[PDB]
Write a protein that binds this ligand. Structure first.
Ligand code: HEM
Ligand code: HEM
Ligand code: HEM
Lengths: 460, 461, 451
């Protein structure tokens, strides 16, 4: 039968995930045990998949469907039946999926671009205005950007994260709420009243999110619709098949969903990308060279951002080593046998462990640990389902091209305007929060003295 | 601040004991961390003492009283407020203890002796009757003996375990009930539906125990009392302090208690004792000689058992290395400070780790891992609180003299009648069930062809 | 000099201290540590708990203070509405119902209730007479059967028939579950929780379904009782009767208040007797002497003086509706040292009042019905199991008559054995009841029913 990691009496495998770095623990277990292993808790079993061979079968949508893991179930407390936390079969999924998909089309992306630039220009300028002693808090600043961008592009709301030294009230609540969700996974006795304090913070944090989301609808029926964005679509889009728009309840869920999904992974990507570049200076130089070659105007155009092909590779290779939404969950639609060896009773759950897929030697070669954006040079070469940072099928990220457009534009501007220094020789430390993010990653920027508008850099 | 083993987030230390050898695990942790360490589980905290100097302070009854371990608290589900599972200040503790204590004194042993011999004879003739290729399964047989022995001596009930090749229906429930107790300890969230089958099985096995017990109690009050034994005392004895006898509810818990406590630990002792003899041939020889020197009659006399001095020393040394009831809990009566450095608030719990106390080199020498009965040649030399296989103070084992008489009788008889071969070269594997017992221990006996009670040895036909 | 106050836990304030299923007994332990008064805070609310006669005397001044709905009572409003228990003094339906309903709870009214009370009491004694020798009694379970059936019949001519059911009546499982839920709301910072409102809602429909059946069938009248008064009675002051919505509320209110506290009292009283044989001997002699006929009369029950004393003395130690709330009508100072602003709440902790030594002596924990021999020698506001003023129990005479007749009959017809050596364990459900109190009853073999 299936291998299984260390067991602990009545608790079975449960205590192994009672750590702050659970995905990383699972990665180490996949290394010991191979492509598939059973994971048991009291009353629950899942199987963890780490090989292209098996993950390919799981990605067959006639045999498997999206499952909501415990984390997604918990997240429903604030995100309800928004796109991320719905079952496929729930009415609001196909309904919302159909209405909002055109908001991440080709034509819609060109419309987000000028606003993306507005936030990116703020980041650059912040770093141009640091004093000589000061360093950069990479992950902190990348989060200021990814939020402000989804806020602005999607809902025409300005969080103004760069006008605040502490993160925005809304984003402190959201992260706390996400942390609480990570915690609930670790609680054997959630009834225990020692968690009453947590239960209270969660409920106040959810109230905060919901007050903003109400203030955002205030801005919009008040605005008199200059704007033409995701919110516009939420409110006025009618489902082709059902002919009705989303009701106000779902709309509130989707706004929250897009604010949480739209910033965190993308923020981890930028941080990791910057981390790999300082640790690989020849790769940094090749990126900086592309940025100077391509970004020849004071602000990047949409077409230019598409031309940054090597930056795209750097981003995909960062997503290869550390996908910032590192696992997703499936369930067998009907009885089925997997890999010709493992029967699954209908309803049984599997877990795609994406970092391990991306380290599967029988598809990426023996090179897997080395950061080499050049693997993505001829895309066609890479087998189907060997690379899945954005999930699978109809339940794949609706936010993919947006994330990649945002990250590419930003990273390109960064390397256009700064050289970077790993002044503390940082040792990688990966915090887990439903996402991966480097923790405590700091760098120093040396300005390349290049103007943003007509306005000169601090060469003044 | 105080040492503490590996932690697991919100589970704290709990998973370190989700093994089926938890006490042995605590011994390893003891060796790494020293004489005191803190142990946390969801919602509780105890501290594990392993040195004579700290334990000696915990055994001061003015400062510390018996605490119900998490194991005993669960045991109440079938043992109620019987003697083992009651708090000192529960009304039925003092009451039962006064009423029953004289039934367990050394004087009282003369009156159990014949019935002990009855069961011991059955063991010897079992082994006398094995075929040549067969072997003895030591723990399994010692359990048969010790259960049947307390059954008969205590309540005049014959389990007839030597008439069965798989244990009495009542035993299997009692063992399963005890396994569920073990498991209950391992759960972070009892009341999780995953455990609902376990809970329905506990209830059934508790019905089985109470079934038998109610039969006995009815058969006695109805069947007019030919015997004079524990149950007689329970039904007729009046507590001097109050003038009140025990109530039928509490009698049912007491019978269960004596059935459960009155065998497992004693069974382990004999099994370990035999193991140490077959691993130490010179000791085995000295024991076999005492046996043949002292046990001159066809069946042992009470006087004779008391003269098996070296056999006694052998048993104490087996208890020193592997005390078969290995831990007990205490709680601080008032605020106090342990060893001049550890403050304890009122009600803070400590655990005595007897296997580690019994290895405290400051108190025993460097010898500690070596099996020498001869340590016990001069009792006076052993320091106070160094040796505590039977617990402490007024909450120490009521069963002490019973156990030692049975084991002394039985081991003396085994060595008179047999030689013993470690034919598999057994590597010690210790099973844990709130007690310690050798697991998978087997030997072959070579009959000495000596008659028992006038019946020719069945190996000499 | 700040008011004493037990430990806080930040934003949850004092609330984690009452995360237990014995919260009143918890409050009692706190009043022992901090004394006659303390602040208690929870998110959004604050009271002060009063334990001394010195203060409670003042809190009972109706010109200075008025009944307050505690949080528990407020939650109860979902099913109890503006019924007599759950309504503010100033709500129109309080004084209105109060005036309409009061006469039908007078001592004179008791004569009329007596025959019905007997029909339930007889059923109790018979159940115990009809046990097989091995069997025992679950005291509080059987007392609830009696108290529920009694208010059902006296109040509404409705037969729950609880002694013909092995298991409690559907209505009363819902009611107990409704109360359990009110209890649980109390220990949540916020009432995520929508999930558990559904069960609460099913239980309230069940309660209402029965009430509506009772009211419809009565409108389509041989009976003359509470529901008759509610339906035909007019308020002298206003000249209008209660409306159908309030009547639904009053019935539910009488069913929940009319059975639980009366039941706890009877269990507690039996508990104190089996624990105090000299007192048991004494009641027994009275019951035997006064209850000369198989079926007791009103006259006879009034003559059970010592039984009455036994009941008050059990209410002293364990008053079964153990607290009530007041608010300050105007700015006032309490005890000449505690300023209170208008609107400020206090909570009378009755069990602690009842243990105040400056008023009761050093004797307070002992069970001594002879305390109540000379009732004029009891200071004012030292004894308050029935609340205070115009917002005091309308049910007080009903309960005591019912408990007096029943306890007297039990002692007439049985001897009782504390066969398990029961150790007191008190369960809270907005009330106090012994939990798992069992006894054995040896019949004195005196007939109730002919041959
Ligand atoms: C590096 C950036 C991102 C990564 C790695 C990422 C990854 C993923 C993954 C793995 C899923 C599927 C989860 C599952 O199977 O349960 C997903 C779903 C989703 N993503 Fe993202 N995402 C990113 C950026 C974004 C952005 C920027 C948005 C929105 C602006 C977004 C919105 C969503 C939504 C709405 C879904 C749910 C879609 C559905 O199942 O119908 N994502 N993403
Ligand atoms: C080698 C054999 C035995 C050992 C090592 C042993 C050990 C112990 C220990 C350590 C305790 C104290 C437990 C604690 O403090 O929580 C104890 C208590 C007890 N033992 Fe034993 N015992 C043995 C034999 C027996 C036998 C044969 C019986 C009955 C027939 C028995 C009955 C009891 C009882 C009733 C208690 C609880 C006494 C009280 O607290 O009043 N024991 N024993
Ligand atoms: C031992 C028996 C009883 C006790 C200890 C008891 C106790 C109390 C207490 C303390 C209050 C006042 C609560 C507050 O001020 O917030 C009260 C009010 C009340 N009681 Fe009782 N009671 C008993 C029996 C009964 C019975 C048998 C009934 C009905 C048949 C009843 C009906 C009521 C009602 C309706 C109120 C509220 C009336 C109003 O405030 O106008 N009680 N009771």
């Amino acid at each position: 039968e299936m291998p299984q990691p260390k067991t602990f009496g009545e608790l079975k495998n449960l205590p192994l995930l009672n750590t702050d770095k659970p995905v990383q623990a699972l990665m180490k277990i996949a290394d010991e045990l191979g492509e598939i292993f059973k994971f048991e808790a009291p009353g629950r079993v899942t199987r963890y998949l780490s090989s292209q061979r098996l993950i390919k079968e799981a990605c067959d949508e006639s045999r498997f469907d999206k499952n909501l893991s415990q984390a997604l179930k918990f997240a429903r407390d604030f995100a309800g039946d928004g796109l991320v936390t719905s079952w496929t079969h729930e009415k609001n999924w196909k309904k919302a999926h159909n209405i909002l998909l055109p908001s991440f089309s080709q034509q819609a992306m060109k419309g987000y671009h000028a606003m993306m630039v507005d936030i990116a220009v703020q980041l650059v300028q912040k770093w141009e205005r640091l004093n000589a002693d000061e360093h950069i808090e990479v992950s902190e600043d990348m989060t200021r950007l990814t939020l402000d961008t989804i806020g602005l592009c999607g809902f025409n709301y300005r969080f103004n994260s760069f006008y605040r030294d502490q993160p925005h009230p809304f984003i402190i609540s959201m992260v706390r709420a996400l942390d609480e969700v990570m915690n609930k996974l670790q609680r054997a006795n959630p009834d225990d009243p020692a968690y009453d304090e947590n239960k209270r913070q969660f409920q106040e944090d959810i109230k905060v999110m919901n007050d903003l989301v109400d203030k955002i609808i205030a801005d919009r029926k008040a605005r008199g619709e200059q704007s033409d964005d995701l919110l516009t679509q939420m409110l006025n889009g009618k489902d082709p098949e059902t002919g009705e728009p989303l009701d106000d309840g779902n709309i509130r869920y989707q706004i929250i969903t897009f604010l949480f999904a739209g910033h965190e992974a993308t923020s981890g990507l930028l941080s990791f990308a910057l981390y790999f570049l300082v640790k690989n200076p020849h790769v940094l130089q090749k990126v900086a060279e592309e940025a100077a070659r391509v970004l020849v105007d004071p602000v990047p155009s949409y077409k230019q951002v598409k031309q940054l092909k090597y930056v795209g590779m750097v981003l995909n290779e960062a997503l290869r080593l550390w996908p910032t939404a590192p696992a997703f969950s499936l369930y067998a639609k009907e009885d089925t046998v997997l890999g010709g060896e493992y029967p699954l009773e209908k309803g049984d759950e599997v877990m795609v462990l994406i970092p391990q897929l991306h380290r599967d030697k029988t598809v990426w070669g023996d090179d897997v640990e080395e950061f080499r954006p050049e693997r993505f040079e001829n895309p066609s070469a890479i087998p189907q389902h060997a690379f899945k940072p954005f999930g699978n099928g109809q339940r794949a990220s609706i936010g993919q091209q947006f994330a990649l457009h945002e990250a590419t534009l930003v990273l390109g501007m960064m390397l256009k305007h700064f050289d970077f220094e790993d002044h503390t020789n940082y040792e990688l430390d990966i915090k887990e929060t439903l996402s991966l993010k480097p923790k405590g990653f700091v760098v120093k920027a040396k300005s390349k003295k290049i103007p943003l508008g007509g306005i000169p850099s601090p060469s003044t």
